[PDB]
Write a protein that binds this ligand. Structure first.
Ligand SMILES: [Ca+2]
Length: 209
């Protein structure tokens, strides 16, 4: 399960074409504008086409695409240990069924205007990649893309100072559900406050333990 990466920039036809760990990925995007060094914002019908081995190409049409020519593609797991990078297009099995899914840097609705993502799970029945609202939504106001551990997904939020929120989601059948929210408040370093909420009887409840 070794992680592999690659970088690329949109050529004169607004095109990239790469093979990352045996999965071919192409990008077709015109009329992009430079957002910051090495990074183009493409929001005029950008297309990300993914061809898994032995399969028909699948075209994704994200609402926008941030193409970082210095960190373009990543193929590997979302380890809390391993992945502290930000990539434009990520191939990774989020739901543990043995087939890679796709994560695309599509917005900047993360915490303090950081990256937010569109998540697409491979749907084995349909032979396609299906946009996942619940998973994409985790990245909104998050400090970055979530990490995956078994069927558990972790994400952090907060005010970038003294309030930190640590979320744990359980993923069952294309559906991410929040099961735990840990809020730590260190505004008074001498009096740190910790709040634990957990999913109980179908609702998030504050708990002592
Ligand atoms: Ca999968």
């Amino acid at each position: 399960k070794m992680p592999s990466t690659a970088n690329a920039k949109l050529n004169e036809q607004g095109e990239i074409s790469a093979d990352i760990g045996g999965i071919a990925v192409s990008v077709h995007a015109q009329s992009c504008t430079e957002d910051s060094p090495g990074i183009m914002l493409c929001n005029r019908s950008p297309v990300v086409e993914v061809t898994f081995p032995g399969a028909k190409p699948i075209a994704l049409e994200p609402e926008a695409l941030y193409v970082d020519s210095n960190s373009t593609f990543y193929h590997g797991p979302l380890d809390d240990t391993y992945k502290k990078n930000r990539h434009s297009i990520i191939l990774t099995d989020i739901n543990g069924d043995g087939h890679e899914d796709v994560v695309v840097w599509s917005g900047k609705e993360g915490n303090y205007g950081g990256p937010s993502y569109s998540v697409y799970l491979f749907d084995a029945a349909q032979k396609t990649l299906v946009f996942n609202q619940s998973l994409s939504d985790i990245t909104v106001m998050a400090n970055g893309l979530f990490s995956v551990k078994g069927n558990m997904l972790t994400s952090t939020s907060g005010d970038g100072c003294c309030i930190h929120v640590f979320d744990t989601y359980e993923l069952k059948n294309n559906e991410a559900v929040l099961i735990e929210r840990l809020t730590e408040d260190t505004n008074d370093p001498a009096n740190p406050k910790k709040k634990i909420e957990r999913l109980q009887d179908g609702e998030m409840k504050e708990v002592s333990n």
